[PDB]
Amino acid sequence: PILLPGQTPFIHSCYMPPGDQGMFSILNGWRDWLISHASTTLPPLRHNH
Amino acid sequence: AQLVQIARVVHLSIPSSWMTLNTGPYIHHHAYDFKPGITQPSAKSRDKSIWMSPILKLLCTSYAMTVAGPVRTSIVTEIDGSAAALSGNLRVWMRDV
Amino acid sequence: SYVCNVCNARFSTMSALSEHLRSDHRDDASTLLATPMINNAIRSFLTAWDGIRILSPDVS
Amino acid sequence: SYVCNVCNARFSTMSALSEHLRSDHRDDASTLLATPMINNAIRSFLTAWDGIRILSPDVS
Amino acid sequence: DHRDDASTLLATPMINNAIRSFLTAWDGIRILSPDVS
Amino acid sequence: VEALSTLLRSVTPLVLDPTVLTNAITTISESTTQTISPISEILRLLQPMG
Amino acid sequence: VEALSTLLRSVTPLVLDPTVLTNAITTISESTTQTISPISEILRLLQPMG
Ligand SMILES: [Zn+2]
Ligand SMILES: [Zn+2]
């Protein structure tokens, strides 16, 4: 991806692996922003994850 | 068995784009699955490390290769669940398929 | 301003909220005392013996 | 508009935000920010590069 | 707050599998009912 | 007997804390490679029937 | 007391580096199969407010 919401463009290298690995790596970097942002924007879910 | 040989058991493979790079030694002795001074003890793989460590190393190096810029050392810092729980679920899935 | 969802405190920057979420409503430190294979047994034991709970010094 | 999720300042363009991140938060370690860390890694990269030629200079 | 976060396999499957198979194999040896007897 | 038992419980300075026993037991280290762990065993036994 | 303490900290060649202790400690080898690692505990004791 070129730019994710909350990030800065052009931070992902072309050597990013396809498939689940690419997904995991992206989410791993994107983790904290997603968690914090979700808390502000949405009500909490009903039981722990 | 080699790192990739065992890691492929869960379909963790090397991207074709990497085939032109000398990734061997990095995966061997640069992707710390358990650095003593950094990792939380909850993530200690214990005896199953014989087949757990390659998986973690593959995940680590994949994330490191994802970001732009120079290659940096990759370190597992924490598993939300215990490493034992992770290994148990993996064994279940391995048995399922 | 940015807010929590558990204690619902408010923060002036998203970064401050993130670290709070990583520190307050996380797991306790006492969980790290032992292996999960024991901690589950410990939890079962305490739950089993909850009937021995000491009464408050008001009903007595 | 865009917000610097650390100092909570607002910016009209991603360019202005990026310049602010590179300039202001040059040494911060907040996980919400990536680019300062990479730039820091690059600085380490250069220092290693010095270690190379310092014991292997170039002759005419 | 928690519902099932403590749930895993909680015993060695190899032992249980060996035990379970053994009991099933020798299940035919079991006793007769007094009615049948 | 029940009435007297309740009275004794109502007025006494003694307090029972199961945690103290767990803390003492869990201080002991042992290999995780054994098939049988006594610590888990005793904790399972200690529980009250009924 | 605060005044003198700040004055002392202002002018002093002495430098306190917590890393040196952790490095000296963490590098000790140990078996990973034990249920209690003293290294983790002692780290957990002096780590708070580091
Ligand atoms: Zn909160
Ligand atoms: Zn800022």
Swiss-Prot record, chain A:
The record's subcellular location field reads: Virion
Origin superkingdom: Viruses
**Signal peptide, first to last residue:** none
- Say which family it is in: Belongs to the reoviridae RNA-directed RNA polymerase family.
Q: What does this protein do?
A: RNA-directed RNA polymerase that is involved in transcription and genome replication. Following infection, it catalyzes the synthesis of fully conservative plus strands. After core assembly, which consists in recruitment of one capped plus-strand for each genomic segments and polymerase complexes, the polymerase switches mode and catalyzes the synthesis of complementary minus-strands.
Name assigned to this protein: RNA-directed RNA polymerase VP2
Q: Which organism is it from?
A: Aquareovirus C (isolate Golden shiner/USA/GSRV/1977)
Q: What is the lineage of its organism?
A: Viruses, Riboviria, Orthornavirae, Duplornaviricota, Resentoviricetes
From Swiss-Prot, chains C, D:
Q: How does it assemble?
A: Homodecamer; each decamer is made up of two conformers of VP2, called VP2A and VP2B. 12 homodecamers assemble to form an icosahedral capsid. Interacts with VP6.
Q: What does this protein do?
A: Inner capsid protein that self-assembles to form an icosahedral capsid with a T=2 symmetry, which consists of 120 copies of VP2, with channels at each of its five-fold vertices. This capsid constitutes the innermost concentric layer of the viral mature particle.
Please state where this protein is localized. Answer: Virion
User: Where exactly are the zinc fingers annotated as C2H2-type?
Assistant: 2-25
Q: What is this protein called?
A: Inner capsid protein VP3
Query: Can you tell which superkingdom this protein's organism belongs to?
Result: Viruses
The UniProt family comment states: Belongs to the turreted BTV-fold inner capsid family.
From Swiss-Prot, chains F, G:
* Similarity section: Belongs to the turreted BTV-fold inner capsid family.
Quick one: which gene encodes this?
Answer: S3
Location(s) in or outside the cell: Virion
What job does this protein perform?
Inner capsid protein that self-assembles to form an icosahedral capsid with a T=2 symmetry, which consists of 120 copies of VP2, with channels at each of its five-fold vertices. This capsid constitutes the innermost concentric layer of the viral mature particle.
Q: What is this protein called?
A: Inner capsid protein VP3
Q: How does it assemble?
A: Homodecamer; each decamer is made up of two conformers of VP2, called VP2A and VP2B. 12 homodecamers assemble to form an icosahedral capsid. Interacts with VP6.
